[PDB]
Subunit: 282 residues, 4 copies
Amino acid sequence: DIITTAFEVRPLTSALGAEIHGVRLEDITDADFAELRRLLLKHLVIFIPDQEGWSAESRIAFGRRFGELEEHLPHLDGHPQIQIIDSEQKIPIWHTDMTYAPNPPIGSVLQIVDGPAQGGDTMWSNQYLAYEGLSAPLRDLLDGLTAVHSIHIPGLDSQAEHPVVRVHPETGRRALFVNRAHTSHIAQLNRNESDALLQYLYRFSTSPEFTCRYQWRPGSVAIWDNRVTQHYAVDDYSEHRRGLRVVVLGDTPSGDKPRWDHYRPVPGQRYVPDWVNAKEAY
Amino acid sequence: DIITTAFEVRPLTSALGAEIHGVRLEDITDADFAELRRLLLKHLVIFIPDQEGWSAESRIAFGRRFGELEEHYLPHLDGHPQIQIIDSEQKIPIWHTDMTYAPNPPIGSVLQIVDGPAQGGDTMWSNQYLAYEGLSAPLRDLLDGLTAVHSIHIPGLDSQAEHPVVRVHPETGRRALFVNRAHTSHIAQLNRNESDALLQYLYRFSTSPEFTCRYQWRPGSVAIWDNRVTQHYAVDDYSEHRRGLRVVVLGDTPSGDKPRWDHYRPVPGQRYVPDWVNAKEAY
Amino acid sequence: FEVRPLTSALGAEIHGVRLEDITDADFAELRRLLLKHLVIFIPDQEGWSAESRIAFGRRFGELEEHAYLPHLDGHPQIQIIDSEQNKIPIWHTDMTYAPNPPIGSVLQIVDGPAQGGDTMWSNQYLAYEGLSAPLRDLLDGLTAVHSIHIPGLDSQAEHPVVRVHPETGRRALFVNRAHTSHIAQLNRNESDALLQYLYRFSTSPEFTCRYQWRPGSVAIWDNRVTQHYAVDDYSEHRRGLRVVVLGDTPSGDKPRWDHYRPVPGQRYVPDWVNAKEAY
Amino acid sequence: AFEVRPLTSALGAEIHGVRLEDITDADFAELRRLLLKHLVIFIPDQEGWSAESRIAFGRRFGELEEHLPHLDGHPQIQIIDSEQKIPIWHTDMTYAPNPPIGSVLQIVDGPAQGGDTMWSNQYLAYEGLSAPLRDLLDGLTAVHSIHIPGLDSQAEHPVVRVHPETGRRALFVNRAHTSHIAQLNRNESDALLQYLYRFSTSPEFTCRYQWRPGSVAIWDNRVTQHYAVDDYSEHRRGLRVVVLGDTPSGDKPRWDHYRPVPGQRYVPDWVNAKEAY
Ligand SMILES: O=C(O)CCC(=O)C(=O)O
Ligand SMILES: O=C(O)CCC(=O)C(=O)O
Ligand SMILES: O=C(O)CCC(=O)C(=O)O
Ligand SMILES: O=C(O)CCC(=O)C(=O)O
Ligand SMILES: [Fe+2]
Ligand SMILES: [Fe+2]
Ligand SMILES: [Fe+2]
Ligand SMILES: [Fe+2]
Ligand code: NA
Ligand code: NA
């Protein structure tokens, strides 16, 4: 339904992703930006090649066309809004950014400025298709559920409850809103039922039929909508890999009112996972 | 190869467990004790009914025939730090071998349920000899060369220990699996993802019903089990008050083959991403 | 009668019964106990006559005349369960691949070892009730296909995932590992994941009992709301006599969704490995 | 000689500056070298490649399969048509005693996006296992089988095979066609194969190729798996030549086959439906 005829557009896969040719971000016009925004709502992640030398001031202004920018992670000297993604300073797990926060980012703009000629691909997945591919009884179940997303590390403790199925505010289409990295458990199920259901959803939602895989070339820029995607940074390289990122704040994942109360354990109830995880990491 | 003809013995299952009749623990003789010890090495867990009123001094002396007794943070009978009080009001249904997160787990325990319902609260035991012997030869060969880290991290108790995956029983010379769901963390020579897959298989296989027994407690019943070669599981199907008296015999050193490989070495920054979901937050 | 429950979940041993000439009023008490305890055990019934065994089964309904299993000579209704002549170490509910599974059975182990060969049963009411409310609500609206495909026997049937016991009105899970194939309104991969969870949860030790057979003991169980499992831990000869009561018609809610419809050429690729060849 | 653009660290490379139609013996040697290095290579812009040249090219690698519809007068050139697919990781025909050593595939009709093919590096799948597990697998074999109307075949192959040219060891099991490991019981086999299948197709071991008109893919079936993504509805047609003659070879097994007892039954620990679609 969204018309996007200005630039030359090369889709990556049927599910999502498109490379946009004929764009120069440095001095982009308002009209050209509006077209990129429509392409982002259509393709969920878009790639802008050959943008070497993009000035810091233009990079920040571009991000601010989408919303307020986050101030984190190292940042570019003189620009707290430009975050540094440096392999010498890696994320090979499917995730949606910062969903342990009540208001995750709406999206990001990432440019790999130094990297290997091969290795270090990034994958994205289409959470609309992950929801739409579930059968009707399961979609109906998930519409009424919420999940807790959490992180507990030194210096960062956060948790948030979000609908399992969210509407995109600017398309009105429903998308799965759970991810392996940050989702803990479904709130209305007991933990063992939650484990079983999330295990299925994590695998199904990152099926190759729902993903794209991008090979970075120096100067390439990726822009993605964090509301309706997951992504994964492939850890297949030893070379130095360095990226500049701006992160657009302000999502509020919203869906149906939950149709059941939170699961209430009895006093002293213990969670015994059905599947083994080690007690100690590396 | 162990002869045990003195008492009336009623085995529970083919795998393990036997109820011993005609026994009075209160003033047991040395000869009768030697027979009970043989029955324990043969049957792994034995049950002695009708022992209501067993005196504290006699219970302690009985335990001490097996080894040194644990004394400790846990309520105990007045004047007897060795006799622990177990109380449902002060419980987790999970297969475990006692305290394998310690370098020296207990040899075994003697437990008598003194208050409880007529049904509910059964305890199951499993035979870790059969769990190992039931694995095919390539897998037994693999496990013989592996060790595993066992650990616990709770308020006031932090402990870990590395044990052979396959231990020999020092007094029978027979080999037994030595991992359990509750306390084993990971196999040391595998990466964590491989470890998870193998332990998941082993935990399920080792508690197959063909390797277990299930005991219904009656007032006065005493259970004595060998912690070197069993797991056990407390069924959580009751709400009534449940109270027991327990003595714990210290002094195991799980021993097996020298490991055939070095510990797995992760690279700097390497991250463990489990293949199977566990929740981040419990109850 | 003196009634001794086995576990909180189900099962009770009944002393003081003589099945051979049981009165109509004593039978009514056994029936009440069966609805309360789901499986009941009657010890000390050695020598129970064939005619009395058949009359007892017929108090519950029509008895099955099996085609494959041997039967006691002269009595097509008394089936033989013999370890030499054939064991079933898999959780199952009897014949759920049929549109009308049995409503229960009466089994007596007449010869067996002093240990080994226990049978376990599970309580499918508690299996359903132990699910959280969103999942109970989901299952209430689903059905499942149960099937068997062997030489000489080919049968499938569609049953509610949650059935209402006709006498008690209480809801019970009605899927089992051995004979359930898939949930009809989900795709096969979703079905696999949900059934895998249900199978393991439904046979949790908190929902089961385990019975050690003594020669002469009789078990009577309600096949509408139980599963059972025959432990395969013995090599000695084990022989039982069984009568099977026909006539279940599992009933539950109208499904809330249509069957899942694959597209032409769609392929089922299971998420979990099974071997392509058995033994 | 050529301009070589690798797809991922693990495997795959696109080769520019090639013309297959009249390729010289020396340029073919370079393609062969690149195939041993990159496991699957992609040759764009080969529209119009003649049937006689396509057959001669395949015959440089070995004998060609002559069994599917095919081009008029050329039973070696198989026609693959979506309208006449299953998304599953597989190595071709491993249910046969001598699976193909590789294939040459050109998509001639297809959509601009959709229908990618992924390949995985079975050397890295093996090498990424820890030493105790590599040691175990070295001594095992597996049965591969297929049972469909008109085709029943099974074969036993080493779980770890030595590539005859490179001498490097590669995993040799795949989800589609491997049944079970022969020296384990079936439940142990399921658990180990489940782990191996998922590990071996990790994204760090794979590449994903987007087909363009005229593109030719050449892959070594001895040390790869591949997967056809099922994300399209448009018509998709390819021309394929299959090179026969693998004999997967590895270590003598260190244990005998597992022997069940009479009457023993296999009860899988994980649910599969009894009926497909
Ligand atoms: O390094 C990458 O490709 C992506 C990193 C990432 O997860 C992010 O920028 O949010
Ligand atoms: O309470 C029981 O039945 C067993 C408790 C237990 O795990 C123990 O005493 O070590
Ligand atoms: O042999 C047993 O204990 C039970 C066998 C069985 O499944 C039956 O009788 O339906
Ligand atoms: O169509 C494809 O991309 C792959 C088909 C395939 O599996 C083969 O040609 O062997
Ligand atoms: Fe990210
Ligand atoms: Fe314990
Ligand atoms: Fe049965
Ligand atoms: Fe193929
Ligand atoms: Na469970
Ligand atoms: Na893995």
